[PDB]
Amino acid sequence: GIEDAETGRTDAVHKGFEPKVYRNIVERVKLSQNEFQNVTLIPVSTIKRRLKNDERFNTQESDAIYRLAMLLKLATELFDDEERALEWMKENVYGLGGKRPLDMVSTTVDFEIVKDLIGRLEHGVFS
Amino acid sequence: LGIEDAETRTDAVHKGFEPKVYRNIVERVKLSQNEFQNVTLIPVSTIKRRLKNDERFNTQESDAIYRLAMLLKLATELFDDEERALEWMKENVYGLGGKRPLDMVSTTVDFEIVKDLIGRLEHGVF
Amino acid sequence: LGIEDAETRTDAVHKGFEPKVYRNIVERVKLSQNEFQNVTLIPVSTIKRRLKNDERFNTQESDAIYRLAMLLKLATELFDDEERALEWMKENVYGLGGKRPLDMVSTTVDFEIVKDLIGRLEHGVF
Amino acid sequence: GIEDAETGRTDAVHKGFEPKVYRNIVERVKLSQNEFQNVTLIPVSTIKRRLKNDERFNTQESDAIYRLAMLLKLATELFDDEERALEWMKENVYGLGGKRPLDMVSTTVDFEIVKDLIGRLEHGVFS
Amino acid sequence: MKLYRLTQKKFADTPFSPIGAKLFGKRWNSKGTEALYFSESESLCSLEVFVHVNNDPAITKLYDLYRIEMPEYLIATLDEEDLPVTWRAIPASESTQYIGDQFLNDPHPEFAALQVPSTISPRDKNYVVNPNHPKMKEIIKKAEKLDFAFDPRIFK
Amino acid sequence: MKLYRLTQKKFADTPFSPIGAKLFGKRWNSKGTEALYFSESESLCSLEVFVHVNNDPAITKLYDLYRIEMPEYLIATLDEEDLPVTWRAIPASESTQYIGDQFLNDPHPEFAALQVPSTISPRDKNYVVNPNHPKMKEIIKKAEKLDFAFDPRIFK
Numbered sequence A, D: 001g002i003e004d005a006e007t008g009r010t011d012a013v014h015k016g017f018e019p020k021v022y023r024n025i026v027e028r029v030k031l032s033q034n035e036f037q038n039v040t041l042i043p044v045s046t047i048k049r050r051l052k053n054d055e056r057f058n059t060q061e062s063d064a065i066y067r068l069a070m071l072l073k074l075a076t077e078l079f080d081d082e083e084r085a086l087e088w089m090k091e092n093v094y095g096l097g098g099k100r101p102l103d104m105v106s107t108t109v110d111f112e113i114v115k116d117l118i119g120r121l122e123h124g125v126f127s
Numbered sequence B, C: 001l002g003i004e005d006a007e008t009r010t011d012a013v014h015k016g017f018e019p020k021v022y023r024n025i026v027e028r029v030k031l032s033q034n035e036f037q038n039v040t041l042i043p044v045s046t047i048k049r050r051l052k053n054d055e056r057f058n059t060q061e062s063d064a065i066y067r068l069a070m071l072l073k074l075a076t077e078l079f080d081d082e083e084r085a086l087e088w089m090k091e092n093v094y095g096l097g098g099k100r101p102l103d104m105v106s107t108t109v110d111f112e113i114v115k116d117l118i119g120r121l122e123h124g125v126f
Numbered sequence E, F: 001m002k003l004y005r006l007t008q009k010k011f012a013d014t015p016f017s018p019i020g021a022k023l024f025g026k027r028w029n030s031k032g033t034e035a036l037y038f039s040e041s042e043s044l045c046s047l048e049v050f051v052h053v054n055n056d057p058a059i060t061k062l063y064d065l066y067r068i069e070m071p072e073y074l075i076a077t078l079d080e081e082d083l084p085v086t087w088r089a090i091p092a093s094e095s096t097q098y099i100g101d102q103f104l105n106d107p108h109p110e111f112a113a114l115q116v117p118s119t120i121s122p123r124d125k126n127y128v129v130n131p132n133h134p135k136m137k138e139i140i141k142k143a144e145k146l147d148f149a150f151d152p153r154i155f156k
Helices: A010-015 A019-028 A033-040 A044-052 A059-079 A082-089 A108-123 B010-015 B019-028 B033-040 B044-052 B059-079 B082-089 B108-122 C010-015 C019-028 C033-040 C044-052 C059-079 C082-089 C108-122 D010-015 D019-028 D033-040 D044-052 D059-079 D082-089 D108-123 E019-024 E042-053 E094-104 E134-141 F019-024 F042-053 F094-104 F134-141
Strands: E002-008 E036-039 E063-069 E075-077 E113-117 E125-129 E144-146 F002-008 F036-039 F063-069 F075-077 F113-117 F125-129 F144-146
Touching (some): A019 A044, A019 A059, A059 B108, A108 B108, A108 F042, B010 B059, B019 B033, B019 B044, B019 B059, B033 B059, B059 B082, C010 C059, C010 D108, C019 C033, C019 C044, C033 C044, C108 D108, D010 D059, D019 D044, D019 D059, D059 D082, D108 E019, D108 E042, E002 E042, E042 F042, E063 E134, E094 E125, F002 F042, F042 F063
Parallel strands (some): F075 F113
Antiparallel strands (some): E002 E063, E063 E144, E113 E125, F002 F036, F002 F063, F063 F144
16 A cells, blocks of 8 residues: 555655656646646745756645645545546535635645545535 | 634634744643744744744644644543643654654644544544 | 427427428418518528428528418417418508518517517407 | 617618627627627628628618627616626526527527526526 | 515516516416416525526525415325426427416316426426415415525535 | 435445544534434435536436435424524534534434534525434335436536
8 A cells, every 4th residue: 555665645745746746747637837836835936946956845845735636536536537526626616615626725724624525525415 | 622722713724823822832732842843844933933023824834733733632532631632642653653643743644644543543443 | 280380399490491391381371482482581592492302491591481380370379260360461450560460570570579469469459 | 669760679670780780789799700690690701791881781680680689688687787698698508408598599489488588587487 | 385486676566476477488388378486495496597597696686585375275286197208398398388277277276386396306396376366365465575595606 | 204315326335324424524513423414305405415516517427316204203403593603604613513413422312313404595404314313224224216307407
């Protein structure tokens, strides 16, 4: 249950996400550097500096990226389709008070709220 | 007891955490400003900056503080005693890879891990 | 009696009207191809073109034919007799500005006007 | 109850709509010449020829334009707002089987369907 | 039974006029037949109308909600077997029109309302009421005007 | 009374497990409290879940609908006065959590379900059921799996 050989998910965040992770995410979620900054609160200059110097993202930045990737995973599990997961991630949600799920990965509180919403939807619990 | 320094709140993190909250929390968990820095990944000089005025902490720092408070409340519900809660929070556990629960509130993922651990302890697994 | 040559249909207009419908209708209203041209604003040569093959009329022409059929059915419900319905359709009325009901099916607006007139006659205003 | 002095609405269609009507409509409904052609089935070349030669639209073309203008009027009466009326005109409607109201002014049958839908919505009748 | 109707505020002077049904009703009645439309709940009543205007989240501001108490003894029930297959077609089938017409234009009306299945959710029932029934005026006198509690932001 | 629940097809082996309520329930219960969520109608049941995914008009293909018959004698009713003002807040108030918890964790349970008002339409009632009630297994045995007739194209 470990990614690669020892990276896993916990060790990956503290070791530091490689910029390839950011590249794959920005290609899969189809969001610009400004939109990535908006969802993860990671400065645009920081992203450019990581990409050019081939420097891995730090642990708080990697934790932000992790919350976003976990949102992608949970939504794809919800819809059994990545495209519908993305549409819903960019869609305003009544259970989030009108905020889209992408706006709910900046902190851990919003991330817990959206995770519980996804669980309720899976199990048909009323919100 | 969470009402004493919290609103039982998602909006307070984006609004920013008031310094009174920092004071009350670091006193109830009985750690120094350096220990607070180590556990929340918030530089001690940043604590000093916020305390210079009555300015609120930014959303990420308030988020770390919220993680600390949630760990405290969950452990207190677990042991049904706050002293036992702290006495377990400051203890290195083999389940957490040689890290104390207090070392598990710097990141969202470590927070999820320590939450799952507290939940399994509530199940009373032996 | 509308079932005899109609589907009791919005889709048939976009699909286009079959020539059998044109035949049955011009016979039940007893008008020549030139009279059909005058009432539906459909050139008689276009009728000949459609009749050359079994091709259907375009949506606008089928729309005019539908207006004609709807006038017939509404007047028949009004007088409770199809002969009286035609005998009123081919009559210049002072209410329609010296134009017969049959002259009121070339355009949507004139169709609305003659429909409102038939409705007021159903109310039996004297 | 007559527009201008004698134009009204019935006399206007047979007399022929002036190109100013098309100009005002395309400015108010915010639709291109291609979209106007799509909703009224009037050829684009015909529209250009009317506009350049200062020729009024013929009676069938004016009847098409009339159905569209009547849709605008009835929708604005429905919402008491022209902007909401336009949004709904460009919006897919469950009562129209998924077609937007703009697609329902090409013939008179679709126009009657949409008029009755608007009436039902005004009086709260179920469709 | 508690039945819910809604109509635009402009019609507040005559909220239960069968005119809308006569002029525009297509599903359970044909033109000229007098009818009133009610629903078992506020939510179904609201959906039936607002689905066609789901782009406006403040549609409620143009409308007024009303509720009546319909005695159980004058509520009749249809049968699915009599219901045709196209009863749920967006181009309303004439068969439902005529079932409703038969109920609504019926002289000597024993029942005042007919339970029909909702086009949106057939297991939840709408109710078509004949105004020409004798014991309806009283029901209209006892009617209560409600404030909307349904949330139109459901349609985002 | 006929009560409607829905859950994703993947959970068909255990449709009435209170696990979703325990792990994710926020409105009428808090984490760890076992609960089941039902609605008075298929439409309200469907809305409560699908409003948050109203962008997908084929959401029904991921879900399964179930219905139970709840005896009237073990359905309890709340009072509006006990209900707080923030009960309808999207950040679910802890007060509703604890009312539900008190009902659900109650030993010696006389009633099996509590009638609560829907967050979408308060006049239409959802029902929160305690699985720990004695006369529930039978109700789960008699449950019927339904095909969805609600139309998700309502959300366009």
